[PDB]
Design a protein around this nucleic acid. Structure first.
Ligand SMILES: Nc1nc2c(ncn2[C@H]2C[C@H](O)[C@@H](COP(=O)(O)NP(=O)(O)OP(=O)(O)O)O2)c(=O)[nH]1
Ligand SMILES: [Mg+2]
Ligand SMILES: [Mg+2]
Length: 425
DNA sequence: ATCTCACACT
DNA sequence: AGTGTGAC
């Protein structure tokens, strides 16, 4: 009997992160419809973060600020800082570190993005259980927790509903069994309340969280009640939850694979995968995908929370959409600009994190081509922008089809520098 | 598309 | 090594 109740996993994700960062810094933006964009010289900038007040007006990510202004006239905007003609995300990376370090105090975390991390609470839950000494869990220890699927069976407002569901869960809880998966999830949720409380006290940032037995369910849970709430997804809530859950909502199925699952099998919801054998899914999607899908639709997933808090690579990119680079002098200048930010971030990384990058990856796009046109690596022996930028030029310089030694053809529409292969130092 | 980062696969 | 996908 397959179980998938072996771990306690949480996913903490910051609410409207970039917006919150700007709001802490500028109190005038607090509790208002606001958004964060970069490069306003074109269409007021492209929206990448939206406060929940602004979302009420229908303002979304990927929307032009000028178009967003049509939906929400009083929409306030904070713009991503610009350096060397490029976007600078320094303020946000640093705010992220604040959050990651607080979370790191409770357990080993996997930085999943700039504003979220997975937490393996299995050992931490076990520790708390003996301390409890068979003591019941008060609802007071879960003041922002939702239990998905509850209340059920035999008030109207949301908070009243939340409490009623929480009480049904706690009233039915068997605290006698220290190996009860449902009990383990509850204690995990109590810890996450503490973890989320610590984040807000020490940063001012609010976040949501999902607590379940694996990463996928935890991630899904987190989005069930946003913002400033956490959701517990038990093993038992899975069949109902997945019964009307679109396949695309599940992490990693939001793209071509998920579309392929829908098209080939003629289904719409995650629960509908259960009627197929593992071999069947393997036949359509391969040995690896098939096994993963077979277990996942039953709420089972084994991807571990990796002990990794730091980025594996450090990269900078810029597009050049009639603005395309057509001279060697142009190509060299922008490679230098990219190299300058790269050196800046690398040096700080070396001091902070006791490591040194060893490989420099260069990538370019050509006006005719469809993301990357060419990607080449070279050795990274010194944190020097001039050296790195000259190196970037050298390995790509053979692309220049122009006979004349001053022009570049055909024009470049993207430059990209990435530092990889870190070694301890 | 006028805006980093991980990982499978090769 | 280089390409493609997926998410954020
Ligand atoms: N440059 C760029 N930045 C982005 C993009 N998408 C997101 N960001 C940046 C902006 C975001 O602030 C940050 C976190 O991304 P989320 O967690 O997926 N969205 P948020 O936390 O804002 O809202 P909530 O979580 O409540 O839904 O990543 C993008 O396409 N491009
Ligand atoms: Mg977020
Ligand atoms: Mg996120």
């Amino acid at each position: 009997m397959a179980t998938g109740q072996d771990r306690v996993v949480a996913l903490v994700d910051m609410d409207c992160f970039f917006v919150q960062v700007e709001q802490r810094q500028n109190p005038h933006l607090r509790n208002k419809p606001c958004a964060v964009v970069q490069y306003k010289s074109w269409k007021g900038g492209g929206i990448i973060a939206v406060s929940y007040e602004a979302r009420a007006f229908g303002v979304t990510r990927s929307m032009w600020a000028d178009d967003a202004k049509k939906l929400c006239p009083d929409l306030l905007l904070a713009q991503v800082r610009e350096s060397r003609g490029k976007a600078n995300l320094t303020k946000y990376r640093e705010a992220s570190v604040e959050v990651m370090e607080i979370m790191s105090r409770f357990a080993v975390i996997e930085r999943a993005s700039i504003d979220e991390a997975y937490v393996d609470l299995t050992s931490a839950v076990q520790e708390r259980l003996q301390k409890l000494q068979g003591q019941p869990i008060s609802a007071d220890l879960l003041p922002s927790t939702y239990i998905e699927g509850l209340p059920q069976g035999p008030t109207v407002q949301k908070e009243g509903m939340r409490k009623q569901g929480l009480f049904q869960w706690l009233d039915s809880l068997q605290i006698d069994n220290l190996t009860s998966p449902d009990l383990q999830l509850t204690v995990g949720a109590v810890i996450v309340e503490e973890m989320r409380a610590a984040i807000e006290r020490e940063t001012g940032f609010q976040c949501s969280a999902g607590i379940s037995h694996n990463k996928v369910l935890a991630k899904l849970a987190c989005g069930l009640n946003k913002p400033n709430r956490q959701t517990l997804v038990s093993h038992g809530s899975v069949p109902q939850l997945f019964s009307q859950m679109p396949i695309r909502k599940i992490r990693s199925l939001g793209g071509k694979l998920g579309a392929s699952v829908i098209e080939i099998l003629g289904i719409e919801y995650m629960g509908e995968l259960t009627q197929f054998t593992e071999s069947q899914l393997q036949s359509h999607f391969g040995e690896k995908n098939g096994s993963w899908l077979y277990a996942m639709c039953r709420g089972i997933e084994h991807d571990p929370v990796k002990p990794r808090q730091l980025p594996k690579t450090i990269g900078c990119s810029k597009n050049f959409p009639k603005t395309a680079l057509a001279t060697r002098e142009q190509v060299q200048w922008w490679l230098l600009q990219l190299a300058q930010e790269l050196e800046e971030r690398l040096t700080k990384d070396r001091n902070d994190n006791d490591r040194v990058a060893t490989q420099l990856v260069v990538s370019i796009r050509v006006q005719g081509d469809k993301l990357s046109s060419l990607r080449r690596c070279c050795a990274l022996t010194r944190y020097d922008a001039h050296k790195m930028s000259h190196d970037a030029f050298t390995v790509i310089k053979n692309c220049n089809t122009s006979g004349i030694q001053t022009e570049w053809s055909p024009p470049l529409t993207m430059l990209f520098l990435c530092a990889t292969k870190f070694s301890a130092s």
